[PDB]
Amino acid sequence: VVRRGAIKVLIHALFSMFIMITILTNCVFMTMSDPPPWSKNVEYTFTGIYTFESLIKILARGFCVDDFTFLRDPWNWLDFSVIMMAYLTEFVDLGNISALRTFRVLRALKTITVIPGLKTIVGALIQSVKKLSDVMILTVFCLSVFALVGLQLFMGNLRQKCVRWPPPFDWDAYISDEGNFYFLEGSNDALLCGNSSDAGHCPEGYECIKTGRNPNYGYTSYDTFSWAFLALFRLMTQDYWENLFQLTLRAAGKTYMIFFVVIIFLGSFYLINLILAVVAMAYAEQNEATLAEDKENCCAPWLKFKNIIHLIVMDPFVDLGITICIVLNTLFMAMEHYPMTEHFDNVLTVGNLVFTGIFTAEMVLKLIAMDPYEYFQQGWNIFDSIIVTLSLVELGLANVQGLSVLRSFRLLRVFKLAKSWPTLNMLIKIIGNSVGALGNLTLVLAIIVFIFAVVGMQLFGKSYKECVCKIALDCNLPRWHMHDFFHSFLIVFRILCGEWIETMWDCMEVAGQAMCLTVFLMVMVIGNLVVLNLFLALLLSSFSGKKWWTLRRACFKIVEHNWFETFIVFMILLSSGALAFEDIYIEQRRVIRTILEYADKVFTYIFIMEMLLKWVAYGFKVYFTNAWCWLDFLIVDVSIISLVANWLGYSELGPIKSLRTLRALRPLRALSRFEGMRVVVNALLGAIPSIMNVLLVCLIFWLIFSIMGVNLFAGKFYYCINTTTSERFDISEVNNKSECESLMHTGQVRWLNVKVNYDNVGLGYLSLLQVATFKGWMDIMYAAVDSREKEEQPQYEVNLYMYLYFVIFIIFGSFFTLNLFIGVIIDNFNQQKKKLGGKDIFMTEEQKKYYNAMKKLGSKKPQKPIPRPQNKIQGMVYDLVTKQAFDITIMILICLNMVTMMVETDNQSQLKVDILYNINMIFIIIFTGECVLKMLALRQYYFTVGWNIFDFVVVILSIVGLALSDLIQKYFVSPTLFRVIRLARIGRVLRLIRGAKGIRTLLFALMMSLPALFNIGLLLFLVMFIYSIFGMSNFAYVKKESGIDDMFNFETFGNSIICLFEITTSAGWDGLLNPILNSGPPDCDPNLENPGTSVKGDCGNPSIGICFFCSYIIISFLIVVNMYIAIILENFNVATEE
Template sequence: MSLRRETVSTFNIIVWLEVLNLFLALLLASFGSNVLSEREKEDDDNKIGEAIDRIQRCIRFIFRLIFRAFCRKKRKKIKIIESITNETIYLNQSLAGTDDLINNIPCSTSINIDNKKIKPNGLLVLTNEAIEPIEDIEMKSLNNNNNPTSPTILSYDQILQMPPDCCPRIISKHVGRFKYIVPESIQQKWTYLRSKAHRLVEHRFFEWLIIASILASSTTLALEDINTRQQPKYYSILHSFDQLFTIIFTAELVLKWFAYGIKNYFTNGWNWLDFLIVVVSVLGSLLDGLGVADIPAFKSMRTLRALRPLKALSRFEGIRVVVNALIGAIPSIFNVLLVCLVFWLIFSIMGVQLFGGKFYKCVYHDTHDRVNISENVTNKIDCLNKNFTWENSRVNFDNVVNGYLALFQVATFKGWIEIMADATDAKDIDVQPAQESNVYRLVYFVLFIILGSFFTLNLFIGVVIDNFNQQKRKLGSGGSIEMFMTDDQKKYYNAMKKMGNKKPTKALPRPRFPIARFFFDLTTNQKFDIFIMMCIFLNMLCMCLEYHNQSRIHERILGYINNFFVAIFTIECGMKLIALHYKYFTIPWNVFDFIIVIASILGQVLGEIMANYFVNPTLLRVVRVARVGRVLRLVKGAKGIRTLLFALAVSMPALFNIGLLLFLVMFIYSIFGMSFFAYVRKAAGVTEIFNFETFPNSLIILFQMCTTAGWSGVLQALTNDRPPDCDPTLKLPSHRGDCGSMAIAIPFLVSYLIISSLVVVNMYIAVILENFSQAQEDVQQVNKN
């Protein structure tokens, strides 16, 4: 058995290293310049159609322009001015013409109406002829307007801040019939309140309040762990905060409806997301108020509160730009998923035909290990007669859905050795498996790994990069990397690119003082740089010679060698300081060298002091870590490494935004995990550290699974739903004892792996490849110049 597993492992390593890299290279090449060149040819063929379309749009634009020029005066009277009597005119308080009023007043320093120039901060009076300016008149409050015949006076800023229609046009059309029945004062108060609400929701302090509420609400969700539920007072406080945040988010929703209008509110996709989150929160609070929130049928509704951190998507620009870029890749990602489903469906059906019902085996009741050959068990009847357990493997091919799950484990190379072992050992239905009874079935898994894993899963990388290439063509010279940056981050990105392309325009002056001139000539000599690089390399080799439990003599010799190199680097730093004076610190690499030298000296001094005064040896090792910084000085002389580091530095804003999105995904799944699997019995991949009992532990296990490491063990623990693996009769808040749920665990883990590992993590690869390619192009361009 051990020999068979070693052979399989060796085969796995060879295939994974060779074939995977080959397929990845082919996919990236296919999604590279060839695809773009083919699409450029297609674009050339469509230029005639685009030209005709532009001509047609130009003709339609000219006709609209002529129509507007002849009908402007008439439309102004119809849309802006509403005559009620011959002497006075009032603003339509039903807001039917507010949008037209706002759109017809340009935002400029002044406006011309009937050859009269009006300042923006002036006052406007609506009369039956035109908009006339009124100067030196105090604006009366709309609430205190007691004269029904006096004109309504509005400032220019207030006209621009007039809120849009509250309801859709169909509703406003019918409601507008009652404007003559409703008193004028009520209509004016309604408009006044809506304008104030609009000013409130647009104020930056209101936005900060909502952001603070989102962060505080997310914190309360993270604190509701297995320990909090055992403390009723603490849990009641968190519950009160949860109700408070529900009220705040509901009030925000109502204010925005009141300010923007229901129609305009739902024209924004981010507002739809906020609306759904508020609805879920309100329903959860209603269920709590009715006392039915703990019923298993309604508990899932309360669990949906975990979606509340998604409100951060519309507030934090860094996450929002990444999501917007990702939305553009959704069609391509969906196509890849469809291809995977089609490929995997074929293999799943084949797996059902080959292995359906054949993964059952006779096991010991306590350990779940397969019974020994000495027990002489050949089929299911013998197993039951001898009081053993006839048990099926957790991952099997009994149906197409189970086959998909088994293939997903094989494609991610986690837990697939056990699946392949069950397949090669299986004989027939209700027959006890025997070791390697059908070795030829390995061909099935080899074909699936090549076609279903190396090819289809790696298409995700190709699709993401291809989508970025398309966006790059649309954005122009900025590149696709700017899709993941905010405006401020784009400024940092452009500044870094300019700094990388910039060459020194003025050489350092040669000092006049003889000693300084000597050190200047010495330190600027290329041979001196080579000597320093050799010292750095030798120092790195000496640091690699340290090992655990080394002899006293060996430790002393390495200490002398280290002191020698510290002295050389200190002398180098001193000579450059004498030669360059204060200009030494104008060169970034010199500042870096100076910091490394100071850290090395402090490490030596503090190391000796700690060793003499019997300080904890752990602190001594931490201080000596500063010596590792000397290795980084090799970067100064390695041009290729500098290019890589420059690409990484330029990528930092985009990588930071993608990291925020990944953290948000992990945060939401952590809340879901604590709600569903906090009390699951520890087994397989769920341990004392890797579990869903607390928020930090949930983040750790999810971070582990975003690399696809150990997720098969976590799946095994979360799908333990019957004795003896768990006890569903335990009285715990989960209503399932310490059992998991296969119906919840499988969608939970599979969806998380697709989002985090196959999509978000691949975005890191795409961003770094894009910046590295851009950095190489910039270096080549600088060298040509």
């Protein structure tokens, strides 16, 4: 029987090695656009191999009946679906529209069948989704409630443009014309305007009229609920959201910030930490479920040579003399910079030949010392041998100048410090697992990113090149397209970094809205679920004279007393709120200026006369050993240096104006006073000795990528510009620095620099901080690619493969480092919780009585209170309300009250408005008619239950929202106040979620976590407040450029608590930093006269701007990460206490 033979070929383990090479060579021929006509047979030979595999499996498993049992194993369904659709192509195409080629990409899923172990991972990636059902109902309920509100508030506001007035089909051909709109220079949308005294105003000669095209390509607006679902889905994921922030505030005015503070908190931060805490509870239960199942020439004088060399190697002070000689190599490479003399240059050519010569001579002694047999057995000596080889391969070339990534491989000697430093040993173990014990879960991740690069190329890549001129005004391809393989990989890599909205608009424009929402949202949902799993997996395997004294006694009782503390806490806040008024409009208002000059002398008398009252009361030694009392002592002492020298002598120059800017630290006195800010500060201070271990690694590990950047990119960012047309020349005429410099006499020509570049290891650190936080990273990448040589004009895509420098850094300096950082904190906070007397961190003592009385409210449930009255006429009413079919009636009437809200649209019809007003009017009538038939039937128990208290307010307020519609006609204009009262009929929808128990536990965790999260939020606000005053005094008068417009600015305190709010999400600080960095003409002007002020000048201060922004990105990262731990550690605690 041949069937007994085919089983011997099926089980034979060389056959499973042959299907593995079949796919991995097919996955190279999928990875190419416009294949040459060598492929028609090669396409058939692969089909010759996959069809033989299907014959060898049906014939092996049995007879013709067995073709049902071959198809019983559902990984064979994909093996059978391949050869069926290939054959259709072979027969011919009934309809040759040619999107059937992307079904051939399903062959790359046969690797899951071939490679051992990849099947049980996909069977668990799908298993961790099952637990996610409850969260996905709540996170789509909340995007839909917020979309209703957003639509109501901003429906139609995005089309407002700034149209002029006519010089005499009159009206509609004047509106439609793009010569009547107002365009900023170098922009392709019209400027967006506002009716209010708050939103943006058009220049003189223009009018803010509503008609227009809309922002972007028309994919941004808030009308049509389906667009307000997407405009608020890029807020949950925070993709480019600070442009949608700066477009609704430019339309609707700055007082609509309150909308985004609630959405960035309640949507973008709470709902993300429900998806992050339910995958982790489902992983850490699936991880625990496996360990439960796992438990249940003179050769004799050549030995005179060998024995004495082995004495040098074994004994110390040469092993200590190598780890010193590594650290003086990496501190010798770091002092390379671009404008560099040939004398300083020849030091570093000579100095790096020497350090190679040590580590080669040190390596060849080790081959002599032990033997070349035992030497290659232990791990580190293999690592040293590659570097000595690669450093000699790079030295041995001495001709090729297009191969200089190889002089950056000698930087890897810094990992030889891994044995001494036990935190850098952890970061090698994290990298070591993902190639080792978790190395099949990185295989899956790699395969998926391969598939979406190929699927995206064959669907969308042919159409980018034919519909070019809808995207780019040059009618060349853009920077980010899909016409090639490597570019569609770079799009799929950018989506996992989180930036999916902006390359989607290009795709939608190019191909269609049907496919581009379908592919770019299936990358993001599937791909972030695999990246997240890998991240979780890494953590879970990381860890496994008598009257003098009476007087003193008397004072002591004043300081401790409760009115004296309440008095001073009130005086901290006035001293802080008086700093907000110091904007550029203080020359304009004279009354508040002279008040705050004399109030400033009242306050420095209170905070001295309470200091001296506290020396006497506490003591002179009990005071200076407090270190809070130290913090108040320095702030008062600054306000005496500024107060005494105001009177006399060295008065206003230099270090006294510079002490004036230290007035922004007066709010730090409040940190000692509130008990909630002290419990948080005492816990963030308890984490510093373990944080400074990690932060020394990230400084060390990013110094390798910083020097590697300087070797590659230093000097290669300069470029020559035609100053009038303002784009850079092509290489065909101005390729060099010394050819742009011979065109200086026409005055049309300037040789300039990218602002954030790689000329130093210092400037490398700031170019790496923009790539790592993904804000600002595009200008760096676009110029790193273009670069040619040390004084040479760039070209548009020479040096195309650099992007991988930025790809390697994001995997290593961000993902791995992040992993290293998170695992330290959780093992810190667990031992700071076990050890601490206070059982729970981040709550005070007064809140834990509020905490435990709130845990009892969500644990109580009665199932027999309150029988009803007994009447004949009145008592027949409750007989049907009590039955189960009353609620099913209302709960389906209330989803139809939601769909009558969703179908509302800007500029709909006069007939459509009249219908929906009639339908909404009867939903007041029924929802009141359920209230009366429940309240009068349940005479006293109606006001009792807390759900029914919420119901009764909504029934009242919905009628209020109807009768007010005549009163608003009686009142003034209404884009502004008619809308906001109608927001409270969305509160009908809330009664909808009363029903789900699963969701009524997820809300509960949030409520439980509310007191802890308020204590850090006070702290975050406190630090936003100090940085808003320090930016208002420094960073006004800066030139209005990229990120500093005319609304979002540091000119006032409303403007600058808005800039500092958006950088708390690390978003858009690259454009706030970009006009600070310039000083000295051109690009900035010294002596610009600002009218109505005395502060002459325009320039920013590049040393204080870098200290401003890089402090706040590091500080608020540390604070916001504590708010992720507070929420996620509470969701675990709720499921634990069940």
